[PDB]
């Protein structure tokens, strides 16, 4: 069901990746035949191995196949972090990044050297660093040291910020997200 939907995104996005210069998997996905993510991963791993043997372990094709398997495993990792984020990241309706998740992502000002503080969602964390996804164009990811993090509740004018155009859009997207959160406006 939802699994079939997520696997369709992965297969599609990996075919787009495959243009780095399998129907069986495509069929098994399209027909919703997979009953596990590890099962899907094993098939991708099998496909990788048959490919590396088919062309040679140092062929251009083997270089691409390893990259494709890596990216696929990355997709499955991301899917586990938050399946709502994963869905919205693929479907991408208008203001897709503004819709809240359950549980809600912690919102922080994240500082990278040279960029000043930028608003972001927390995807996961450990004691010394936080994996964040920034608001604004491109919606990129970065591991941020714990000491470069401030909770979203502090006023922005008290933080080192560089007010580029992209920064303003990011803050506008942040405010729209906070509104959707208060509204209880979930994506349907």
């Amino acid at each position: 069901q939802e699994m079939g939907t997520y696997l369709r995104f992965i297969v599609s996005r990996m075919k787009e990746r495959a243009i780095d210069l399998v129907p069986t998997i495509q069929e098994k996905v399209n027909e919703g035949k997979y009953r596990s993510y590890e099962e899907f991963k094993a098939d991708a791993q099998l496909l990788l191995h048959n490919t590396v043997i088919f062309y040679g372990a140092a062929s251009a094709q083997a270089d691409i196949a390893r990259m494709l398997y890596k990216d696929t495993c990355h997709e499955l990792d991301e899917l586990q972090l938050c399946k709502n984020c994963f869905y919205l990241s693929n479907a991408r309706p208008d203001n897709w990044f503004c819709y809240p998740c359950i549980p809600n992502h912690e919102l922080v000002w994240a500082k990278m050297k040279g960029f000043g503080f930028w608003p972001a969602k927390v995807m996961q964390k450990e004691d010394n660093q936080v994996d964040v996804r920034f608001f604004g164009h491109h919606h990129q990811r970065a591991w941020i040291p714990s000491e470069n993090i401030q909770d979203i509740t502090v006023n922005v004018h008290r933080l080192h910020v560089k007010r580029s155009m992209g920064w303003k859009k990011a803050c506008d997207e942040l405010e729209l997200h906070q509104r959707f959160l208060r509204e209880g406006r979930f994506w349907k």
Binding site: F9, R13, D71, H74, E75, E78, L81, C85, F86, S89, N90, R92, M112, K113, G114, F115, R133, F134, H138, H139, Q140, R141, A142
Partner: peptide
Amino acid sequence: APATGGVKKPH
């Protein structure tokens, strides 16, 4: 770039 976001390059 992955749909869930690529790594933001250091300044």
